[PDB]
């Protein structure tokens, strides 16, 4: 997650604890199960960065529903992108000319994002954020149909 610091925008990570604990959630009740939903839901309740998701997801899946999910959230992905494409005015964009997003910076692998959680919190924007995390959200949900 972001927190807005005195410098500006800072990484602060997941609670390390509800991350294990949700891990368990999962094996223990299962994908498909309300418990596990509403706790994936209230972990993803505040805006994510690709740092955040992508070892969220790790953690809490297995090696294959994680494939799953990464394959889910690339296509999720993609739709924000054709919307902010589509609409110039997409909460994804930013206000200027040179500020409408992408897949590289959805995905954190932008010039200056690459395995950084700060430099994520520092570039992105928040209706990135946003898109990012019901990205993920979504491409958990599908993991979960498909369990
Ligand atoms: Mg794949």
Excluded: C
């Amino acid at each position: 997650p972001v927190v807005i610091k005195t410098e500006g925008p800072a990484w602060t990570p997941l609670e390390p604890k509800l991350i294990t604990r949700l891990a368990d959630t999962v094996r223990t009740k299962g994908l498909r199960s309300p418990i596990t939903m509403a706790e994936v839901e209230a972990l993803m309740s505040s805006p994510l960065l690709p740092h955040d998701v992508t070892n969220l997801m790790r953690v809490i899946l297995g090696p294959a529903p994680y494939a799953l999910w990464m394959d889910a959230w690339g296509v999720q992905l993609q739709t924000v992108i054709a919307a902010a494409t589509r609409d110039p005015r997409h909460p994804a964009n930013g206000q200027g000319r040179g500020e409408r997003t992408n897949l590289n910076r959805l995905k954190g692998l932008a010039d200056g994002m690459v395995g950084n959680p700060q430099g994520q919190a520092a570039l992105l924007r928040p209706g990135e954020l946003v898109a990012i995390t019901a990205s993920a959200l979504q491409a958990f949900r599908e993991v979960a149909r498909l369990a």
